């Protein structure tokens, strides 16, 4: 490893992605851990751990997505599902905006950009969800709330089965001890995966992911002295992410097939369309 103008560019690329990553997503991992451990001047998330606390929460948490004027299923599982949909729709936009700040992405074929976003979005979502999770639960409503893992497991089938695989994934992933600087490059690597179905102009994509991959390895070698294999361990995680997405799609089809036509937001349909 060397200090040459190549690596200097790698580091400049890392700072750019980080700077953009910070301003593209609301709740960074650094803030989330702080919240998660009480180390914050911020109030403290309202904890939802049973039905009574869920109800008390819907009153005393100001959810970005509801108004006193709409309804609003009677069934808590469906309501929780709906808030998730809204959060995912927002995250798709934050991810798009972030994708556009990746040097070169915006010059790809516009059709390929769509394809990269379609497949990358949920992988990035689950990657970043881990930042909000510990083994007990997950930050919600931009850290205003915290919903416990066991409360999520107790929602009626099938809904009680959506978050569990994400918690399991998070526990393992959080053990990598990545920080936001690491994560900004990693999620860029995900977006620029040249092996997504239907790409038409793969070469320019691989060239960008290549630089991204160098910026990532340099970053992890600089940032994690006590971690001999972080780069490969992290690449392998891109694999478990694809299976999490796949599993999530198959459960999504228990809904729809067996729910009540409590339908998916069209942006979300778009993404799931001919996914896998």
């Amino acid at each position: 490893m060397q200090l040459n103008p190549e690596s200097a560019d790698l580091r400049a690329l890392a700072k750019h992605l980080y700077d953009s990553y910070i301003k593209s997503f609301p709740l960074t991992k650094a803030k989330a851990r702080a919240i998660l451990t009480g180390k914050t001047t911020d109030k403290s998330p309202f904890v939802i751990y049973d039905m009574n606390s869920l109800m008390m929460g819907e009153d005393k948490i100001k959810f970005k997505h509801i108004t006193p004027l709409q309804e609003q299923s009677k069934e808590v599982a469906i309501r929780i599902f709906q808030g998730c949909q809204f959060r995912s729709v927002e995250a798709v936009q934050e991810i798009t905006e972030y994708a556009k700040s990746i040097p070169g992405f915006v010059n790809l074929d516009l059709n390929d950009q769509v394809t990269l976003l379609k497949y990358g979005v949920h992988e990035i979502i689950y990657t970043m969800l881990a930042s909000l999770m510990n083994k007990d639960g997950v930050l919600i409503s931009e850290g205003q709330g915290f919903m416990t893992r066991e409360f999520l497991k107790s929602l009626r089938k099938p809904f009680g089965d959506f978050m569990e695989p994400k918690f399991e994934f998070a526990v393992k992933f959080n053990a990598l001890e990545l920080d936001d600087s690491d994560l900004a490059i990693f999620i860029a690597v995900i977006i620029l995966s040249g092996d997504r179905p239907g790409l038409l102009n793969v070469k320019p994509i691989e060239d960008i992911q290549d630089n991204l991959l160098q910026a990532l390895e340099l970053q992890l070698k600089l940032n994690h002295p006590e971690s001999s294999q972080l780069f490969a361990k992290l690449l392998q995680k891109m694999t478990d992410l694809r299976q999490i997405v796949t599993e999530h799609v198959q459960l999504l089809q228990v809904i729809k097939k067996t729910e009540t036509d409590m339908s998916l937001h069209p942006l979300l349909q778009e993404i799931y369309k001919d996914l896998y």
Binding site: T96, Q113, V114, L117, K118, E270, I271
Partner: peptide, 12 residues
């Protein structure tokens, strides 16, 4: 075409 919203988002 099949991703009209995603197209929009990237075109703005």
């Amino acid at each position: 075409e099949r991703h009209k919203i995603l197209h929009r988002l990237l075109q703005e």
